[PDB]
Amino acid sequence: SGWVWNQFFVLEEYTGTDPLYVGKLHSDMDRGDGSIKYILSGEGAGIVFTIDDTTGDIHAIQRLDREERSQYTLRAQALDRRTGRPMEPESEFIIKIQD
Amino acid sequence: SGWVWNQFFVLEEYTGTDPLYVGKLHSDMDRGDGSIKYILSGEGAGIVFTIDDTTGDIHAIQRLDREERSQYTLRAQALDRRTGRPMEPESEFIIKIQD
Numbered sequence: 390s391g392w393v394w395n396q397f398f399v400l401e402e403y404t405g406t407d408p409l410y411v412g413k414l415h416s417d418m419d420r421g422d423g424s425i426k427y428i429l430s431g432e433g434a435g436i437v438f439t440i441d442d443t444t445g446d447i448h449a450i451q452r453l454d455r456e457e458r459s460q461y462t463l464r465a466q467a468l469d470r471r472t473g474r475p476m477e478p479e480s481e482f483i484i485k486i487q488d
Numbered sequence: 489s490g491w492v493w494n495q496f497f498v499l500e501e502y503t504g505t506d507p508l509y510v511g512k513l514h515s516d517m518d519r520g521d522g523s524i525k526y527i528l529s530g531e532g533a534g535i536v537f538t539i540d541d542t543t544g545d546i547h548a549i550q551r552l553d554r555e556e557r558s559q560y561t562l563r564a565q566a567l568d569r570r571t572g573r574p575m576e577p578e579s580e581f582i583i584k585i586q587d
Contacts, residue, residue, distance in 0.1 A: 419492035
């Protein structure tokens with residue numbers, strides 16, 4: 390189908406210093422036992438957006454502004470903890486900033 | 489792939505009678521001219537969540553509590569604005585309340 394789901398939305402009003410929950414990465418192969426390691430890559434990964442590599446939760450940790458930068462293209466990876474070998478194909482997703 | 493993307497995340501803290509931007513329905517068939525009509529149905533549609541049928545923008549319009557309900561199962565439609573014929577299969581998506 391042509392539906393676009395691989396995006397998250399962030400209200401800039403609510404961003405700033407304190408981590409603002411954005412969304413979470415999740416593979417249907419995650420059995421729930423933490424054997425998947427979620428990795429963020431691409432625009433502002435680790436700097437503008439953090440990820441918990443176990444839960445896949447994503448937080449914005451900078452003050453954001455739509456006029457400055459209206460969106461970020463990131464990449465999601467899902468690796469086997471032990472091996473570091475990919476369990477999903479790496480997938481781009483976007484975080485859009487709403488004003 | 490197994491990446492689960494058909495979900496939006498609503499922080500409980502920011503909900504209220506003021507519309508809280510939740511996310512957006514979007515078809516890649518959308519030319520940008522309003523010839524697509526986005527329709528939203530299912531759990532909390534119309535009472536908790538509304539949609540702009542042109543932009544596809546979803547807002548939560550009630551104050552929500554995770555412990556009362558952690559998630560809503562909704563349905564997305566994309567109709568050709570002139571004929572009312574579907575341009576996409578009707579697709580399920582989820583809105584998760586967090587905190």
